[PDB]
Write a protein that binds this ligand. Structure first.
Ligand code: SF4
Ligand code: SF4
Ligand code: SF4
Lengths: 353, 166, 127, 384, 180, 196
């Protein structure tokens, strides 16, 4: 926050409450949109019922969710059973304020973001650990080892790819020289769309975030059709809804962070509109991700662990070392453009055999 | 609190539950495959509110018993039902479930209402997917308090609200 | 096999069974409620066969709302079965004409018939 | 971890109970427990007329039901000496191959969903819905159709069946080729299925794994060629095979089978000429319904046939057939009465299940579901 | 086979842009084939006389034993059937009925014939035992449909359309392909 | 070709050969020779063991040697190494009070579940079986269903006002031991067969 002002604390609180309730409405209507987009993918159609567009069916669903006999299972830890959903939900909600939705003041006077901490990616990493925390903790508290095992699968896979996230995020810091999202964004304003320089890191960040329940491990696991996943199978009225809510908010937070970090967080080369381009990139990644959800298989999380551990994380650290050599010798910044373009050409030509 | 004790609130929550009816299939026989057909891309029970399908029993209000219920499966289905959240309803799909059907013998339960409190019955062998949709609208308007029998009586929103579980 | 109680005497049958059961543990026993007309329980009558595995106990069709106090007699009966630890409750469907002669068949035949025709049932429907 | 994968949960299709003795991510041994669908056909059928039993045959294997219908019909025809018209035979082979395609569609959809992705279920089920529209056109029922008869078939085809069947026969080659394009060049399915599912032919034989997962392990044994029954002897026939039995080879073999079945349907439709539809022997076939208002013999035979039925000779009989799940057959003991003395069914889904602990031995835990889906079980057939 | 991921995504996109395929029941009437096995109907002759001569052949051919037929003697003054016998009581337990059509197949007078109605889901076991006067050709609708149209005052609309009704259903009125 | 040698071997040792003019063949071995004879059969190249089917002849109009009879089905796959295609049945009668029979599970692993099923449905105990556990009938089920002394267990069908149906008294069809509704049954209804 070198160049950016700070709103009053009451205004920060207001913006925080706004972002939280907006993530509520966002995940609800994005569940609607994913239902209907999957329905379009498989030639059927979505809920033209209780809507018109189905947009009262989340209301009916929430109204069912409450009054639904929130049950505290016996032989489960009385306190932890209740406590774990709150953790998983809070630490998924937060860490979205950092994302700048405009130049300073473009929130109709005050601040596109909530907080613009000087060290951003570390905040993201830390709060990403806490999702896996909630997952395996609820797995334990469920008092069913069947669910616990899935929670452990989850924790193993998510932890692997969450470690990979760090080596992925290393590279752009060398170029920007700041850990503030707005500084990185302005660097992408000047030189342009950091992913053009760091395409391998972009790819590994994408595939790592896929492991964060997005899809294709798909041995996340969900209870369906496998050794059941963790964090669910014992919650009935509100806590299960909270688990799914947090998983979706993390999904969309990653879908927003990918353009925010690697691509052009809003800051378009042309027309520089504050919010719309960021939301459009969010929607783009959301649609591509739903395409993946529909269109790709499981990994058994053994192949997933093997792949993440042996391929993604070594590749990310190799690219980090190359970029570190380049920045230390500082020779051009054009060499990184050339290198990323050639790496993309290589990782593409190997497909069409 | 069960969705009761205010004229507007209870109709609103019944509206919500009726449209948010969460099916949990208990597939037993070919009735189960004819119910899987009620989800394909010709006639989908994915519009009224039954898009999502959580295999867990802790997560659904509607229990759809689709197929012949063998006496060896009765306690399992019994406990799957007991392990459901409380605002829960029971649909009995097909002849084998409703009555003993054409299999009138030692192996099959002659009325699933023996083991679980049944809300709706739907005859047929198999009952057509559109007959199943008629049954779910029937249950919808039942939990709306819009359901009457041939004797003139209004039917309670939730069966299994009237039993001394134990 | 023992036969206690008499038809259409709900409270006499209930008290006779109360006396005859004693401290018998019903953890592995099976309770067969013999009735007709699956659907309509408001005018249904009930007999009981208790298959302990070492000996059986028969009570004729004297329970259920079909008789005055027979509904409350059946509720108390099933409640006492559950209290004694009975878990396996079954409902047998016989014809009205059968119900009378079925209790006059020899024990092995009557018990084999009941075990073949019995449906697992939620005892709660009798509470 | 002696883990209890319960009946119907979690999402184990074909309700079954499993005691997976397992430490880690492998599969040490699965102890199967069945009987949750046992209805008692082998006993209930002893108390039904031979005509009545045609309502009981589709309901065990409810996916490929017309194979049950055909096996039972043929066994009774052999036992009482009946003559099947050629056009009725052609219709029977068409219906059998059509229900085969429907069953293959449902099997592959269920497997891909069971492990893999959800999307490809819907296309297979759209083609299945076209097939079910054909079945409604002809029999008035989706499945469990009471169409086959001891003499032949119940009645003749409407005008609209052949055009819609040609429509589907024209769209199907492209469709099956699409499924193959998606699957055979398996991106992840390869690294998921190629290794898993160990099927040595010797153990398949010792445990009797006949049901269509045997040829995926390189054994060329198909009943439609070894023991031709319904005139398949007169069809140009390719029998797909696999190199080493895995999920991959199983699935690809079944896809080639679907294309070959489509080719058989085209051939049979080409060789189709009008004629009669069932054995006119009144002891076997009810009198024509039009002269029920004219002949005392017609009325008597109608009345007697539809109440008592007919009495086959005293004897035991059996005929084998090839369904989409392997060898099927009925061992029928008739005592000269109007109801069969005993009917035992050889259940291919039942004999195939003896090779499950071996097949999934040492395989992965997520793959324990895929290896079950790939074996194509039907618990209506297993428990029976 | 890295190409397969891309090809799969592509074909899924093609089918995404393929919008149409579905039918929205009850908003769109389901298309049924003419031979469909629906609600039983008892048919009448052109004279108006019922065809059913109460011959219990439909019950004898019943594998589920779902047909109860109590017969009686036709009254010459006001006849019901064509012979000396008609159907005094004709009950069918739809919950026991397995929908063969063997009852029609044994019907010598063409009285009992399976119909086209399928919207017969109901709440009570004892309400699903259909009687004669619930199956006559004159009736339009199923039991819950009619009960709803009476407690609603809104006429019955069936959720099906057919190209035509079979001749055995003579008298059975239905929506046909757009003839209306 | 292997079937001809089976018939020749059975006839020389006094084993009855039952044949219908429809194409089905049985070889009935005594209880003693059953195990060793079928071991020899597997040795002859009978790869596949199709079925183990138990039969209760209690209610059969003509009498039989023993109440129960177990029939095995042996096959040799035609498309395997040297496939003839010879398939045939082995019938073995079992006394009512001696429900014993050696398993062939050691020979074919197919017999495992089939013999467990036969034990479930009939009281037939298979000697040497790895696990003889009730497969199909409920864990708490008492007896063996498919032997004729075991009731089918029907439930009456229900209608509006006291009107019910008992299928066992409603059935118009006759069994072989059922005399019929007239003074007797002859002709077709004592057995009928057309001459192709
Ligand atoms: S009612 Fe018919 S379709 Fe349903 S389980 Fe029974 S046999 Fe199958
Ligand atoms: S269609 Fe129904 S009433 Fe008719 S014979 Fe079949 S089960 Fe009986
Ligand atoms: S078979 Fe036909 S004429 Fe005879 S009783 Fe039945 S409906 Fe009436």
């Amino acid at each position: 926050t070198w160049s950016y002002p700070v709103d009053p604390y009451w205004m920060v609180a207001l913006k925080a409450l706004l972002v939280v309730v907006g993530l509520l409405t966002a995940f609800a209507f994005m569940t609607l949109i994913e239902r209907r987009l999957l329905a379009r993918f498989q030639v059927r159609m979505g809920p033209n019922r209780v809507g018109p567009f189905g947009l009262l069916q989340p209301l009916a669903d929430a109204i069912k969710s409450i009054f639904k006999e929130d049950i505290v299972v016996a032989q489960a830890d009385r306190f932890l059973f209740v406590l774990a959903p709150l953790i998983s939900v809070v630490f998924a909600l937060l860490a979205f304020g950092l994302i700048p939705f405009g130049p300073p003041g473009s929130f109709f006077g005050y601040q596109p973001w909530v907080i613009n901490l000087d060290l951003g990616i570390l905040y993201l990493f830390a709060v990403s650990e806490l999702a896996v925390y909630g997952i395996f903790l609820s797995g334990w508290a469920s008092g069913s080892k069947y669910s616990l095992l899935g929670s452990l699968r989850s924790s193993a896979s998510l932890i692997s790819y969450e470690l990979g996230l760090g080596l992925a995020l290393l590279a752009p810091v060398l170029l920007v020289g700041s850990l503030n999202l707005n500084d990185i964004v302005n660097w992408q304003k000047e030189h342009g769309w950091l992913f053009l320089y760091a395409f391998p890191a972009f790819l590994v960040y994408l595939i790592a975030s896929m492991a964060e329940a997005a899809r294709t491990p798909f041995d996340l696991p969900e209870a369906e059709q496998e050794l059941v996943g963790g964090y669910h199978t014992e919650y009935s009225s509100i806590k299960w809804a909270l688990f799914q809510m947090a998983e979706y908010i993390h999904f969309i937070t990653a879908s927003a962070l990918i353009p925010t970090l690697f691509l052009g967080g809003w800051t378009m080369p042309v027309l520089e509109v504050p919010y719309l381009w960021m939301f459009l990139k969010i929607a783009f990644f959301l649609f591509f991700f739903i395409w993946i959800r529909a269109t790709w298989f499981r990994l058994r999380y053994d192949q997933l662990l093997r792949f993440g551990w042996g391929f993604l994380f070594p590749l990310a650290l190799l690219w980090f070392l190359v970029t570190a050599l380049v920045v230390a010798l500082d020779l051009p910044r054009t060499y990184l453009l050339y290198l990323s373009a050639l790496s993309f050409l290589v990782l593409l030509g190997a497909v069409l055999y | 609190r069960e969705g009761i004790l205010f004229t507007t609130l209870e109709k609103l929550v019944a509206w919500g539950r009726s449209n948010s009816l969460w099916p949990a299939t208990f597939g037993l026989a070919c009735c189960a495959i004819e119910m899987m057909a009620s989800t394909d891309a010709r006639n989908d029970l994915a519009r009224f509110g039954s898009e999502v399908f959580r295999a867990s029993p802790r997560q659904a209000d509607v229990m759809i018993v689709a197929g012949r219920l063998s006496k060896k499966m009765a306690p399992v289905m019994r406990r799957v039902w007991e392990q459901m959240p409380d605002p829960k309803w029971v649909i009995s799909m097909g002849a084998c479930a409703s009555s003993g059907g054409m299999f009138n013998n030692y192996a099959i339960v002659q009325n699933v209402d023996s083991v679980v409190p049944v809300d709706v019955y739907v005859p047929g062998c198999p009952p057509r997917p559109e007959a199943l949709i008629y049954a779910v609208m029937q249950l919808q308007k039942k939990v709306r308090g819009q359901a009457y029998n041939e004797r003139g009586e209004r039917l309670p929103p939730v069966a299994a609200w009237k039993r001394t579980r134990g | 096999m023992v036969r206690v109680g008499m038809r259409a005497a709900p409270r006499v049958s209930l008290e006779a069974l109360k006396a005859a059961l004693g401290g018998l543990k019903l953890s592995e026993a099976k309770v067969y409620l013999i009735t007709d007309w699956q659907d309509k329980r408001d005018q249904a009558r009930y007999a009981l066969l208790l298959h302990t595995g070492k000996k059986d106990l028969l009570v004729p069709d004297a329970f259920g709302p079909a008789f005055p106090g027979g509904e409350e007699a059946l509720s108390e009966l099933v409640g006492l079965l559950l209290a004694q630890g009975a878990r396996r409750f079954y409902e047998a469907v016989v014809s009205p004409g059968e119900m009378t002669a079925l209790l006059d068949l020899p024990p092995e035949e009557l018990l084999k018939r009941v075990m073949a025709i019995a449906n697992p049932t939620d005892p709660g429907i009798y509470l | 971890m002696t883990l209890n994968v319960g009946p119907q949960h979690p999402s184990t299709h074909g309700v079954l109970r499993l005691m997976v003795t397992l430490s880690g991510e492998e599969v040490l041994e699965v102890v199967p427990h069945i009987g949750y669908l046992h209805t008692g056909f082998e006993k209930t059928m002893e108390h039904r007329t031979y005509l009545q039993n045609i309502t009981y045959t589709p309901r065990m294997d409810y996916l490929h039901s017309f194979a049950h219908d055909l096996a039972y019909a043929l066994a009774v025809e052999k036992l009482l000496g009946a003559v099947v018209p050629p056009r009725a035979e052609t219709i029977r082979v068409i219906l059998n191959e059509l229900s085969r395609l429907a069953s293959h569609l449902v099997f592959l959809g269920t497997g891909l969903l069971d492990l893999g992705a959800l999307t490809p279920f819907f296309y297979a089920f759209r083609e299945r819905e076209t097939i079910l529209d054909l079945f409604e056109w002809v029999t008035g029922q989706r499945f469990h159709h009471n169409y086959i008869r001891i003499g032949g078939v119940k009645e003749d085809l409407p005008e609209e069946f052949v055009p819609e069947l040609k429509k589907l026969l024209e769209v199907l080659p492209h469709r099956i080729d699409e499924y193959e394009a998606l699957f055979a060049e398996s991106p992840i399915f390869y690294e998921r299925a190629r290794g898993v599912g160990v099927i040595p032919p010797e153990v398949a034989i010792d445990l009797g794994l006949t049901g269509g997962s045997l040829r995926a392990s390189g054994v060329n044994y198909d009943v439609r060629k070894a023991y031709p029954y319904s005139g398949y002897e007169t069809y140009t026939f390719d029998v797909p095979l696999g190199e080493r039995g895995d999920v991959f080879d199983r699935m690809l073999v079944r896809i080639r089978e679907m294309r070959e079945s489509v080719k058989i349907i085209k051939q049979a439709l080409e060789r189709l000429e009008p004629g009669p539809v069932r054995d006119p022997n009144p002891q076997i076939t009810p009198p024509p319904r039009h002269l029920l208002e004219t002949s005392m013999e017609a009325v008597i035979y109608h009345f007697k046939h539809y109440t008592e039925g007919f009495h086959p000779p005293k004897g035991e009989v059996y005929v084998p057939t090839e369904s989409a799940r392997g060898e099927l057959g009925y061992y029928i003991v008739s005592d000269g009465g109007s109801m069969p003395y005993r009917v035992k069914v050889r259940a291919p889904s039942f004999v195939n299940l003896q090779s499950l602990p071996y097949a999934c031995k040492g395989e992965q835990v997520p793959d324990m579901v895929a290896i079950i889906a790939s074996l194509d079980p039907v618990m209506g057939d297993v428990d029976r | 086979t890295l190409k397969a991921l891309a090809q799969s995504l592509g074909i899924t996109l093609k089918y995404l842009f393929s919008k149409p395929v579905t039918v929205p029941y009850p908003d769109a009437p389901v298309a049924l084939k003419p031979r469909f096995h629906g609600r039983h109907v008892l048919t009448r002759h052109p004279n108006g006389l019922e065809k059913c001569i109460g011959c219990s052949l439909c019950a004898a051919a019943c594998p589920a034993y779902a047909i109860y037929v109590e017969p009686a003697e036709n009254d010459p003054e006001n006849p019901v059937s064509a012979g000396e016998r008609y159907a005094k009581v004709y009950e069918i337990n739809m919950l026991r009925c397995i929908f063969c059509g063997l009852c029609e197949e044994a019907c010598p007078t063409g009285a009992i014939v399976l119909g086209y109605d399928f919207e017969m889901a109901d709440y009570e076991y004892s309400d699903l035992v259909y009687g004669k006067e619930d199956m006559l050709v004159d009736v339009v609708g199923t039991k819950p449909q009619r009960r709803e149209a009476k407690r609603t005052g809104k006429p019955v609309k069936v959720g099906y359309v057919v190209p035509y009704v079979r001749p055995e259903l003579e008298g059975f009125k239905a929506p046909t392909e757009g003839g209306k | 070709m292997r079937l001809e040698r089976v018939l020749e071997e059975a006839r020389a040792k006094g084993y009855p050969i039952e044949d219908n003019g429809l194409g089905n063949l049985w070889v009935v071995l005594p209880r003693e020779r059953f195990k060793e004879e079928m071991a020899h059969y597997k040795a002859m190249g009978f790869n596949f063991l199709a079925d183990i089917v138990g039969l209760d002849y209690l209610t059969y109009p003509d009498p039989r040697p023993e109440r129960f009879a177990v029939v095995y089905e042996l096959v040799s796959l035609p498309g395997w190494k040297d496939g003839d295609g010879s398939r045939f049945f082995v019938r073995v009668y079992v006394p009512e009070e001696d429900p014993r029979l050696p398993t062939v599970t050691d020979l074919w692993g197919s017999a495992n579940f089939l013999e467990r099923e036969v034990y479930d449905l009939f009281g037939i105990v298979f000697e040497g079986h790895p696990d003889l556990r009730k497969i199909l009938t409920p864990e708490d089920l008492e007896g063996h269903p498919l032997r004729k002394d075991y009731p089918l267990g029907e439930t009456p069908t229900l209608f509006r006002e006291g009107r019910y149906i008992i299928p066992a008294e409603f059935r118009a069809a006759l069994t072989g031991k059922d005399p019929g509704l007239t003074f007797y049954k002859g002709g077709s209804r004592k057995g009928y067969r057309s001459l192709w």
